[PDB]
Structure 1
Amino acid sequence: MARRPARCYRYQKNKPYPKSRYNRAVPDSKIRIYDLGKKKATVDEFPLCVHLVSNELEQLSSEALEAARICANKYITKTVGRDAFHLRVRVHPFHVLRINKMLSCAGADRLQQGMRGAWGKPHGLAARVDIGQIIFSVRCKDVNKPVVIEGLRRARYKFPGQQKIILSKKWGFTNLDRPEYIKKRDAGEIKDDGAFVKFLSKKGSLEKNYNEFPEYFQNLSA
C-alpha cells in the first residue's frame, strides 16, 4: 500500500504504542544502523561534539531517520572521507503507527463499514521526540566542524519542523565539559573501552581502582 504522508503522523497525538506482546503483527524499522563513521575511534580522537536537536515535540518517522542518516553520511563522507567522524542517531523508532486499512474501489461502501471497528493496523514505526532532545550527534576533530555542520544542515531537510545545530560544550560523546575533561584525562583516571571511556570514582574498592587506574595513583604520588 502507498505510504501515507507524514503530515498525518506529525504530532504525538496518541499514547506510545511499542512493539510488545499486545502489539504483535508489526513490520520492522527501516533504520537499522545507528552508529556510523569511524565508530570505533577512541574518545580523544574526536573531541568536538555537535548535535542536531529538535526544537519542538513531534514524531520522527523511522524511515525519515533512516533517510536523513543516509544523506548525512553521504555529505560528510565524500567531504572528509570515511573515517573522520562518528555519528550516532540518538532517537529510536519504538512508536508503532496505526493505519485504518480501507477499500477505495468501485462502490466499496458496501464491502466496507467505515468507522465501525476502526482500530487501525500497524503502518510503520516512528520515533517520539520532545523539545530539546537530540536527534543526531556527530563527533569529529575540531577542524571538521564546517563539514559536519553542513552535513547536519543537509540532514535537517529530511525532518519536519525546526531543528538546530548546537555545538555542544562537552568533550565528544562524554558528559564532561572540554576544559575539565582535559584535566581529567591528564590526571589519568580515564580508560578507553573500545569507543568510550571509564571514569575513576572516589568511591570503590581501592584494589579494584588500582587494577583499573594505576596511572592516577602514580600521577598523584609523583
Structure 2
Amino acid sequence: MGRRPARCYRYCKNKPYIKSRYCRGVPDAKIRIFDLGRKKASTDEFPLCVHLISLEKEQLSSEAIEAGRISCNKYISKTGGKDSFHMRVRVHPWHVLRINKMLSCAGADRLQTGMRGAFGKPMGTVARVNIGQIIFSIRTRDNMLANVVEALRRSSYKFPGRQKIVVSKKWGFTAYNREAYQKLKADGRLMNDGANVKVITNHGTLAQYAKDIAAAN
C-alpha cells in the first residue's frame, strides 16, 4: 500500500485473510492483469522459460507486482517485442492488510485512536509467497535469454529483499522437460491447445475402450 512504507508488511505473519462475504470492505487489487505480450502464441515455438523467484518468505505487495510488470513490458519492446514474452506472473494477491487508523490525531486524540475496538479496516491488497513460489515467468523463443533476464533483474529491484532469477529445463508452462517434449512429437502423443499441450495418453474410464488413442489423434 502506497500510504504505508511496506516495511510494515514484508513478513508473512497472521493467518491469511481474503475477499469474501466476510471481508467486504476491501479496495480493488492494484494488478488486475496478468497478460504481458503475445498470449495467442503456440506451445511449439517458444521453447524457453525463465523464472523469477522470491528468495525470501514474505508478503509481496500488489503495487510492487504491478511496478515489476513494467520492467517486463517497457523492456518487452526495447528487446525483441511482443513475439517473445508470454507472462502469467504466477502469483496473485488474495491476502488483505488492515489499518487501525490513528491518523485522526495530528494535535490531540479522541481516545478511539487507542487500542479499544482495535481491529483494523481493509486497506491494502497483497500476496503471500514462500521461497520456491514463483513470481514472474516469461515463456519465450530461445534467441531471447539475456534480453529477458534483464527484465527479471529489473523487476527484482522492485521487490522487497532477495530475488533469484533462473531458466528452467522445459518448454514453459508445461510439466515436461525439453528432452521429454520431443518424445511427444515423435511418438504421436503431441496434442496442441494454442498455448498448452494435453499430451495423448492411453487410459480407461469407460466399459470397453479404443477411442482413448483415436480421440485427439
1:112-161 deviations in Å (ceiling 9; x for gaps): 34111110011111111001111111111111011110111111111001
Which ranges of structure 2 fall in alignment gaps of 5 or more residues?
none
1:11 aligned onto 2:11:
yes
The 5-angstrom pairing of residues 127-142 of structure 1 reads 127-142=127-142
Aligned partner of 1:90 in structure 2 is: 90
Aligned partner of 2:213 in structure 1 is: 209
Secondary structure at the aligned position of 1:98 is classed as strand
The answer as to whether partners of 1:52 and 1:165 remain within 8 angstroms in 2 is yes
**How many Å apart are 1:187 and its aligned residue?**
1.9
The answer as to whether partners of 1:46 and 1:85 remain within 8 angstroms in 2 is no
CA gap of 1:147–1:127, structure 2 versus 1, over 3 A, is: same
1:14 maps to a residue whose letter is N
1:44-69 deviations in Å (ceiling 9; x for gaps): 21100100011121000111111101
Percent identity over the alignment is 63
The more displaced of 121-130 and 79-88 is 79-88
Structure having the larger proportion of residues in helix: 1
The more displaced of 97-106 and 116-125 is 97-106
The runs of at least 4 consecutive aligned structure 1 residues that moved more than 3 Å come to none
Aligned partner of 1:49 in structure 2 is: 49
Q: TM-score, normalised by structure 2?
A: 0.92
Root-mean-square deviation over aligned CA pairs: 1.6
The answer as to whether partners of 2:201 and 2:212 remain within 8 angstroms in 1 is no
1:32-53 deviations in Å (ceiling 9; x for gaps): 1112111110112110010001
Q: TM-score, normalised by structure 1?
A: 0.90
The answer as to whether partners of 2:202 and 2:212 remain within 8 angstroms in 1 is no
Which ranges of structure 1 fall in alignment gaps of 5 or more residues?
214-222
> Residues of 1 paired with 2:59 and 2:211: CA distance?
48
> Residues of 2 paired with 1:104 and 1:13: CA distance?
28
